[PDB]
Amino acid sequence: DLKWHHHNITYWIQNYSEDLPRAVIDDAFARAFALWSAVTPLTFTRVYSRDADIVIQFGVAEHGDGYPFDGKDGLLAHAFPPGPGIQGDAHFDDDELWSLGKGVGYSLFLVAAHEFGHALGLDHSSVPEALMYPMYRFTEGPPLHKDDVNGIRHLYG
C-alpha cells in the first residue's frame, strides 16, 4: 500500500544484534520512531507479538524473504511498504557493525529512521541533507529535512 490505514502502529523487535546492548538497541529504535511520530498523526507502540505492523529483524545474507543482504557494507538494511504480513517490516544487515555512528560502524538510529521512513511509505529524496536520501552519511545534526516532512505530510497530513 501507499500508506498505513490505521494510525496506531505497532512494532516487534523479533531478534537482536550482539553489537550493542539490548537496552541501547531498544532505545535507538524508540528514538527513530519518535522522529516520525512528532511530525505525523501516527503513534508507535512496542509489542511482543508476531502480529505487529512493523516486524524488526537482524539477519545476514539470505534471511528468508528472497532479498538477500551482501556482507559488510553495500546494502545496510531494507524495509517493505505498508500493508499486511511482510509489508511494513524492517530488516538490518548484521554483517554491518551497528553503533552510535560516531565511531566505527553505522548509526543504528539513523539507519532505522531511514528504514522506518520506507515502512511508512516514503521513497527516496533528491536532497543530500534529507533523511530519505539514498546514501548513508553520518551526521550529528537534526536528521529531518523539509523534504522528509513534506513527503510524510503528503501521505498522512
Ligand SMILES: CC(=O)N[C@@H]1[C@@H](OC(C)=O)[C@H](OC(C)=O)[C@@H](COC(C)=O)O[C@H]1NC(=S)N/C=C/N([C@@H](C(=O)O)C(C)C)S(=O)(=O)c1ccc(-c2ccccc2)cc1
Ligand atoms: C535507485 C535509487 O533509488 N537510487 C539510488 C542511487 O543512489 C544515489 C542517488 O546516490 C544509485 O543510483 C546511481 C547509480 O546513482 C544506486 C547506486 O547503487 C548502489 C547499490 O549503491 O542506488 C540506488 N538506491 C537503492 S534503492 N539502493 C539500495 C538502498 N538501500 C536500501 C534502502 O534504501 O533502504 C534498499 C535496499 C531498500 S541501502 O541499503 O543501500 C541503504 C540503506 C540506508 C541508507 C540510509 C540513508 C540515509 C540515512 C541512513 C541510511 C542508504 C542506503
Ligand SMILES: [Ca+2]
Ligand atoms: Ca551489507
Ligand SMILES: [Ca+2]
Ligand atoms: Ca508487517
Ligand SMILES: [Ca+2]
Ligand atoms: Ca553486526
Ligand SMILES: [Zn+2]
Ligand atoms: Zn529482509
Ligand SMILES: [Zn+2]
Ligand atoms: Zn532507502
